[PDB]
Amino acid sequence: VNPTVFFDIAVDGEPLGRVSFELFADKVPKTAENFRALSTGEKGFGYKGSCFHRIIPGFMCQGGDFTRHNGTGGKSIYGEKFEDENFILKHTGPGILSMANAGPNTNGSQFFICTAKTEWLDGKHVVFGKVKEGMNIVEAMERFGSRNGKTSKKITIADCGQL
Numbered sequence: 080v081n082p083t084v085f086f087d088i089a090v091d092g093e094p095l096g097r098v099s100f101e102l103f104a105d106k107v108p109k110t111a112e113n114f115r116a117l118s119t120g121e122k123g124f125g126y127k128g129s130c131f132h133r134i135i136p137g138f139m140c141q142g143g144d145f146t147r148h149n150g151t152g153g154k155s156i157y158g159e160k161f162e163d164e165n166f167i168l169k170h171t172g173p174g175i176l177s178m179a180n181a182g183p184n185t186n187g188s189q190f191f192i193c194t195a196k197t198e199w200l201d202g203k204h205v206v207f208g209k210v211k212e213g214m215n216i217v218e219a220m221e222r223f224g225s226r227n228g229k230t231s232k233k234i235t236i237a238d239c240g241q242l
Contacts, residue, residue, distance in 0.1 A: 081105060084118040086126070087238035088216055090223060096216030098192075099242065100176055102208045107164045110178060110186065110207040113155050117143070117188055118239040122156045126188070131234040133191075134224030140217060141179055141191035141228075142236065150179075153188035160185045168206035170197040174217070176208030194221050 085099040102111035117125040124145060131142035132149055146152035155161045162184040170177060170193055177200065179189035192210065194217065210217060223232045 082111070082115050083211060083242040084115055085240060085242055086118075086236045088220060089235045089237040090220075091232045092235075094237065095219060096213055098213035098216050099211045100208045101211045102176075103168065103206075106167050107205060107207040109157075109161070109164045110205050113157065113161070113186075113188070114176075114190065114207065115241060116156050117145075119241050120239075124154075126236050126239050129236055131220060131230065131236075133228035134221060134230050134234065135194075135226065135228050136221045136224050137195050139191040139193050139195070139197065140220050140224070140234075141189065142234075143179070143187075143189040145188060150189065155187050160187055162186070163205055164207075166202045166205065169201045170204070170206060172196045174210035174214050175206055176210070177204045177206045180204060192217055194218070 082102050088095045104111040116122050129145040131140050133141040144153040173194050175193040178186045180186050223230050
């Protein structure tokens with residue numbers, strides 16, 4: 080059965096809500112397992128305490144950089160990077176969960192939640208999940224963003240894990 084993880088989001092330290100994701104381990108098992116193990120911190124590191132450093136309304140909320148907190152760091156459980164598993168799944172609309180990267184086969188820990196349809200990233204970013212509950216909480220994160228991505232308040236993952 081496809082695993083389910085959750086984020087407890089905080090805005091400048093104040094609780095905001097819970098976002099839960101369905102990870103399509105059946106279709107992208109390696110990518111979904113990385114994200115799952117970073118949400119539980121079972122490898123010693125992960126997402127708990129990291130932030131959403133780049134939020135663009137109408138585009139996507141991006142986070143997952145738990146070593147440099149600005150988009151220049153992060154690492155997977157398999158090493159500093161790992162390959163593109165497949166591009167079966169498409170960026171069909173809001174709620175999609177896809178992996179960020181700096182070129183072919185450079186996936187680490189940085190993901191982005193689509194707040195819109197982003198079909199131009201098909202074949203370039205691996206889709207591996209979707210928001211299951213708390214899409215309202217993601218839309219509340221979006222309003223603390225800006226056209227260039229700098230957030231007006233600190234959006235953090237106060238807690239994460241598996242359900």
